[PDB]
């Protein structure tokens, strides 16, 4: 199963399922954050998805092929988090990104704080292109989470 879309990543323990994250299927490749799966194989129906590429520092992993998502934030426009919360239908949250300033350049960041099982949710530009994934970031104040817009390299 490789139909394009956003997907929940679920885990079955000994008793009951839970959502551990989210991912993007595009061009036959499944994309998520490394810390969601830690590189483990995934089941998709009766088939198996094997990891293909991964990098802990970028916190990204791809299944069935190399990373395909290459769009980037234009640094000016609003974006949408396509959040897939556990137990709820997918929903779009529009926001203007802030910025992580690093010694190696700036990274867009969204100051949106959704439940943990939302990690891997895609961030979209106004043309619907995935410009990165949600869920690796920092906490600034008390509980105010800010996520990098994490994008790989195609």
């Amino acid at each position: 199963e490789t139909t394009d879309g956003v997907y929940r990543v679920m885990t079955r323990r000994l008793l009951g399922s839970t959502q551990v994250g989210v991912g993007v299927m595009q061009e036959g490749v499944f994309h998520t954050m490394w810390h969601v799966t830690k590189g483990a194989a995934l089941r998709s129906g009766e088939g198996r998805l094997d990891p293909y590429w991964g990098d802990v520092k970028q916190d990204l992993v791809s299944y069935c092929g190399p990373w395909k998502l290459d769009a980037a934030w234009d640094g000016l426009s609003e974006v949408q988090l396509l959040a897939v919360p556990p137990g709820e239908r997918a929903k779009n949250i529009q926001t203007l990104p802030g910025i992580f300033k690093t010694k190696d350049g700036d990274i867009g960041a969204v100051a949106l704080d959704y439940p943990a099982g939302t990690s891997g949710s895609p961030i979209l530009d106004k043309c619907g292109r995935v410009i990165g994934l949600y869920g690796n970031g920092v906490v600034i104040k008390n509980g105010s989470y800010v996520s990098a817009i994490t994008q790989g390299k195609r």
Partner: protein, 38 residues
């Protein structure tokens, strides 16, 4: 046992709610992929 389940199209929504600040933060990224505030 991890498995995936489709949850929607990848689409921009004209009726999305809008929210969130736009903070500018100095950060560092270490080899484990962890951001920290500078």
């Amino acid at each position: 046992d991890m498995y995936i389940e489709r949850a929607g199209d990848i689409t921009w929504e004209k009726d999305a709610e809008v929210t969130g600040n736009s903070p500018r933060l100095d950060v560092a990224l270490d080899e484990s992929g962890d951001f920290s505030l500078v």
